[PDB]
Amino acid sequence: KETAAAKFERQHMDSSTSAASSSNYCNQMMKSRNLTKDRCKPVNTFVHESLADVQAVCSQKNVACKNGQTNCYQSYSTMSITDCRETGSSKYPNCAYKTTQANKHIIVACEGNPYVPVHFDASVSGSGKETAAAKFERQHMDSSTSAASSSNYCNQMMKSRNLTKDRCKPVNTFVHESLADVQAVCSQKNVACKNGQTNCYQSYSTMSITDCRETGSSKYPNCAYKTTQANKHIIVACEGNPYVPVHFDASV
């Protein structure tokens, strides 16, 4: 009795190779992964990243699924993938595939506790205007973990969230709570923002957060950060309809 999570790993995870080696990669992989047992599965994608990196996508950019469901997520970073497309001459049981290597953003459907990938929805190339709300989630939300597990957390997250692309963002906080919990802050204690505007809100409760601050010797493009885990109230600026966070003002 294969779990949906396990099925996704069998069909879409290749955490053993950084990329497709041979034009026969798909020919071998589709067979070994049982995607040609009772029929030649026409098309399939394998992801060449750690299971951790792929599972992490479930806490990244929320997008509508092709089927209309709302539990799809697009990766902030492009990933190494291999598309497998059955050839025209392919004929079961000797299923034959065209192997195609690329680096694209992936979109996966997520379910469960833990919240993990259960379907592969699409791949995307990607300018791309970001809503203020989406930017807040990219810069300040890390629902994938309850706290920083090591001192390298910020080094990795500041990079993976694209906060070091052109320069090292000196200071940044990630919040380890549900998006619903953070969005609820916009209906809590109204306070002034640092800038004197009054669309800021302090969370009634303390929250698990990770403070990232560039070290004194950090120099682009070699961004280095000190990681500090804490439990503090957060203060966010909220805007729009739905009324959601668009800036991280402070923690207290």
Binding residues for substrate: 7, 10, 41-45, 66, 85, 135, 138, 169-173, 194, 213
Beta-carbon count within 10 A of 115 CB = 15
Is the peptide bond preceding residue 242 cis, with omega within 30 degrees of 0? Answer: yes
Identify the three-state secondary structure at position 110.
Answer: strand
**Spatial distance between the Cα atoms of 244 and 182, rounded to a whole number of angstroms:** 9
Q: Is 119 a catalytic residue?
A: yes
Task: Choose the catalytic residue: 48, 105, 140, 176.
Answer: 140
Q: Is 233 a catalytic residue?
A: no
Q: Is 140 a catalytic residue?
A: yes
The answer to whether 41 touches 30, Cβ cutoff 8 Å, is: yes
**Spatial distance between the Cα atoms of 213 and 169, rounded to a whole number of angstroms:** 8
Task: Choose the catalytic residue: 12, 48, 105, 176.
Answer: 12
Rg (CA), the chain: 21
**Spatial distance between the Cα atoms of 72 and 198, rounded to a whole number of angstroms:** 34
CA 119 from centre of chain = 15
Task: Choose the catalytic residue: 48, 105, 176, 247.
Answer: 247
**Spatial distance between the Cα atoms of 201 and 179, rounded to a whole number of angstroms:** 15
Contacts of 21 (CB under 8 A, 6+ apart): none
Task: Choose the catalytic residue: 105, 119, 176, 233.
Answer: 119
Q: Is 105 a catalytic residue?
A: no
Using alpha carbons, select from 1, 4, 7 the residue that is nearest to residue 33.
7
Identify the three-state secondary structure at position 59.
Answer: helix
Binding residues: 7, 10, 41-45, 66, 85, 135, 138, 169-173, 194, 213
Catalytic residues: 12, 119, 140, 247
